[PDB]
């Protein structure tokens, strides 16, 4: 069962090939965290983690190569709770499971020290040959506030899977606390998901999707671990996005994307603005419950003229998205290759989907991004909602932006964005932009 060689997803193959260029590099170390408003029992949480991990195949996997140099995924079960985890020199290695406990209460700046710790951890390489490609840490920030850090290698966990992990973790936690039997892990099968992709790449649908994207683009550097600047915005400042959505009839995420497009137009003055958007990569019941890495990104060609309202820009986004979602299965990476050069670049706008407050039986955890992945330019990451407040993270390529560049660009973008949301009828050229 540990001998079975599992196939990688298209997204996993991409990460593998890009990782073989810089083995020691930590460019694919990603992660998120849960801000928890109440005290949690570390011992129980450490126990719930092992149970959660054991039920999550992708978190128990290592990556190796066969006799052809081709990569494959190997399943390495974790040791039982309380076990000494004794390994034989020629036996199957256990998947280590560790929930670090870091008590930062009573310190000068708990939050800042925790952030420095997380940035330090994601700078650490995570060899694929070793099982358990994740790093966990529970911070105590005093005042009953905790912060759970989830660090991973991109190849095992995507954005969607982070949420799945969190909800499962809490589910297990509540079980052990109530003394109830732990609910059966309702996770999917990666093999079937992989087969689903293979079947697709052989279908005539793949040809039409590729044709659509190629023909749409028939007229800079390496992807690196981004420097991250986060900005917390309270509901008092984010509700306006919700009202812009209500008024324009578009989902608030479309409003943010239009905001970015308008921002790029104002700063660069380019008629045709390109902005990439992530897509789930999960098609079918099985895929949508199978924790792993199948995330994907596709470019939006947005034509923007200054003499048009913000509402019109919003429509242009929804129209372009219509054509994009109709061909979502096609890999953005494959598109960049068939076109050569630096491919289709520009900022990536990732408005993460709603995640219900993770309930630990009283205490509640809110998810916010630490690093969504490497970029050649910029990643704009949002979490939360217009009603409950937002976390705006600017993730920039360190060769393009500096920490201070990101903070400035981020600030003037949020002010500009809120300025647009306030009056969607206003012309793009007239909206106040801090320079």
Do 81 and 99 contact (CB within 8 A), yes or no? no
> Is the CB of residue 327 less than 8 Å from the CB of residue 206?
no
> Which of 169, 197, 189, 392 has its CA nearest to residue 289?
189
Give the torsion sign (CA, 308, 309, 314, 319): negative
- Pairing mode of beta strands 134-140, 99-103: parallel
Give the relative orientation of helices 252-268 and 310-325 as an angle to the nearest 10 degrees.
110
Rounded CA-CA distance 159/296 in Å is: 11
What's the DSSP call for residue 288? Answer: G
**Token pair listed for 131:** 């099982």
- Output the CA–CA distances (angstroms, integers) from residue 284 to 31, 264, 298, 329, 430, in the order listed: 26, 35, 20, 12, 45
Contacts of residue 207, defined as CB under 8 A and 6 or more positions apart, other chains included, come to: none
Q: Any bridge partners for residue 367, and if so which?
A: 34
Residues contacting 334, CB < 8 A, separation 6+: 210
Helix (H, G, I), strand (E, B) or coil at 73: strand
For 3, 77, 87, 180, 427, the CA distances from 315, given in Å and listed in that order, are 52, 49, 59, 50, 14
Residue 257 makes CB contacts below 8 A (sequence gap 6+) with 275, 277, 300, 317, 349, 351
What size, in residues, is the chain? 435
Reported as type and span, the H/E element at residue 65 is: strand 61-65
Separation CA 265–CA 302 (nearest Å): 10
- Residue 356 is encoded by which pair of tokens? 């219900």
CA of residue 426 relative to chain centroid, distance: 33
Query: Which contacts of 175-182 are long-range, i.e. CB under 8 A and separated by 24 or more positions?
Result: 175/48, 176/44, 176/47, 176/48, 177/41, 177/44, 177/361, 178/361, 182/51
User: Where in the chain are all domains bearing CATH 3.30.559.10?
Assistant: 8-219
Q: How many C-beta atoms lie closer than 10 Å to residue 426's C-beta?
A: 15
DSSP alpha helices (H): ranges in 179-287?
Answer: 190-202, 204-216, 235-248, 252-268
Burial classification of residue 254, based on how many CB atoms lie within 10 Å of its CB (0-12 exposed, 13-18 middle, 19 or more buried): buried
Q: Which CATH class is domain 221-435?
A: alpha beta
Whether residue 187 contacts residue 291, with contact meaning beta carbons closer than 8 Å, is answered with: yes
Any idea which residue has 């196939």 for tokens?
A: 7
With b meaning 16 or more CB within 10 Å and e meaning fewer, what string describes 151-190?
A: bbbbbbbbbbbbbbbbbbbbbbbbbbbeeeeeeebebbeb
The span from the CA of 280 to the CA of 282, in Å, is: 5
CA 337 to chain centre: 23
At which residue do the structure tokens 């801090």 appear? 434
The Cα–Cα gap between 361 and 212 comes to 48
List, in sequence order, the alpha helices (H) in 217-364.
235-248, 252-268, 310-325, 332-339
**Which pair of tokens denotes residue 302?**
């947005």
- Three-state secondary-structure class, residue 97: coil
Cα–Cα nearest to 346, from 277, 422, 399, 402: 277
- CATH code 3.30.559.30 region(s) in the chain: 221-435
User: Can you tell me whether residue 274 is helix, strand or coil?
Assistant: strand
CA 235 to chain CA centroid, Å, is 23
| Residue 309 burial class via C-beta count within 10 angstroms: exposed 0-12, middle 13-18, buried 19 and up | middle
Q: Is 361 left (phi over 0), alpha (psi -120 to 50) or beta?
A: left
Strand partners, 378: 396
Six token digits for residue 434: 């801090």
Cα–Cα distance for residue pair 11/190, rounded to 1 Å = 13
Question: Is the distance from CB of 18 to CB of 28 less than 8 angstroms?
Answer: yes
Beta-carbon contacts of 228 under 8 Å, excluding residues fewer than 6 positions away, are 119, 370, 371, 393, 394, 395, 406
In whole angstroms, give the CA distance from residue 373 to residue 380. Answer: 11
Give, in order, the Cα–Cα distances in Å from 92 to each of 49, 61, 269.
21, 12, 58
- For 8-219, the fitting CATH number among 3.60.150.10, 3.50.50.60, 3.40.50.300, 3.30.559.10 is 3.30.559.10
Q: How far is CA 63 from CA 34, 127, 129, 194, 336, in A?
A: 28, 9, 5, 15, 25
Residues 6+ apart with CB under 8 A from 340: none
Nearest C-alpha neighbor of 349 from the set 260, 410, 262, 271: 260
- Token digits for 204? 């005539």
Are 344 and 217 in contact by the 8 Å Cβ rule? The answer is yes
Helix axes 235-248, 310-325, angle to 10 degrees: 70
313 token code pair: 């820009």
- Report CA-CA distances (Å) from 298 to 209, 217, 223, 339: 12, 12, 16, 14
Spatial distance between the Cα atoms of 124 and 26, rounded to a whole number of angstroms: 6
Give the integer Cα–Cα distance in Å for 281 and 289: 12
Cα separation, 154 vs 225, in Å, equals: 11
By the 8 A CB rule, do 230 and 391 touch?
A: yes
- Way the structure was solved: X-ray
CA distances from 341 to 165, 223, 330 (A): 37, 13, 19
């Amino acid at each position: 069962n540990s001998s079975v060689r599992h196939g990688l997803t298209s997204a996993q193959h991409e990460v593998w090939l890009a990782q073989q260029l810089d083995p020691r590099g930590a460019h694919y170390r990603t992660g998120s965290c849960l801000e928890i408003d109440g005290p949690l029992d570390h011992a129980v949480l450490s126990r719930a983690l092992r149970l959660t991990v054991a039920g999550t195949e992708t978190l128990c996997s290592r990556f190796l190569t066969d006799e052809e140099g081709r990569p494959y995924r190997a399943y390495c079960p974790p040791a039982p709770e309380g076990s000494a985890a004794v390994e034989d020199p020629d036996g199957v290695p256990y998947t280590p499971v560790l929930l670090r406990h870091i008590d930062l209460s009573g310190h000068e700046d708990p939050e800042g020290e925790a952030q420095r710790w997380m940035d330090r951890d994601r700078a650490t390489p995570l060899p694929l040959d070793r099982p358990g490609l994740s790093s966990h840490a529970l911070f105590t920030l005093g005042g009953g506030r905790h912060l759970y850090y989830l660090g991973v290698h991109h190849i095992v966990i995507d954005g969607t899977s982070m949420a799945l992990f969190y909800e499962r973790l809490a589910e297990v936690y509540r079980a052990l606390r109530d003394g109830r039997a732990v609910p059966a892990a309702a996770f999917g099968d990666t093999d079937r998901m992989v087969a689903g992709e293979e079947a697709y790449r052989a279908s005539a649908r793949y040809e039409r999707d590729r044709a659509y994207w190629t023909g749409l683009f028939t007229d800079g550097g390496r992807a690196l671990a981004p420097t991250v600047r986060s900005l917390g915005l309270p509901p008092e400042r984010t509700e306006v996005l919700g009202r812009a959505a209500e008024a324009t009839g578009a989902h608030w995420a479309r409003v943010v994307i239009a905001g970015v497009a308008a921002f790029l137009h104002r700063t660069t003055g380019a008629r045709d603005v390109v902005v990439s958007v992530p897509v789930t990569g999960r098609y079918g019941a099985n895929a949508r419950i199978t924790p792993g890495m199948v995330s994907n990104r596709l470019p939006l060609r947005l034509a923007v003229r200054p003499g048009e309202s913000f509402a019109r820009v919003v429509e242009t986004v929804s129209e372009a998205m219509s054509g994009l979602l109709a061909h979502s299965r096609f890999r953005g990476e494959d598109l960049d290759r068939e076109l050569g050069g630096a491919g289709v670049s520009g900022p990536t706008v990732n408005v993460m989907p709603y995640i219900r407050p993770v309930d630990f039986g009283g205490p509640v955890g809110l998810m916010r991004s630490i690093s969504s992945g490497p970029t050649t330019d910029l990643n704009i990451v949002l979490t939360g909602t217009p009603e409950s407040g937002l976390r705006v993270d600017f993730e920039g390529n360190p060769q393009v932006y500096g920490g201070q560049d990101l903070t400035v660009l981020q600030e003037r973008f949020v002010r500009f964005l809120a300025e647009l949301a306030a009056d969607p009828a206003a012309t793009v050229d007239e909206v106040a932009l801090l320079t």
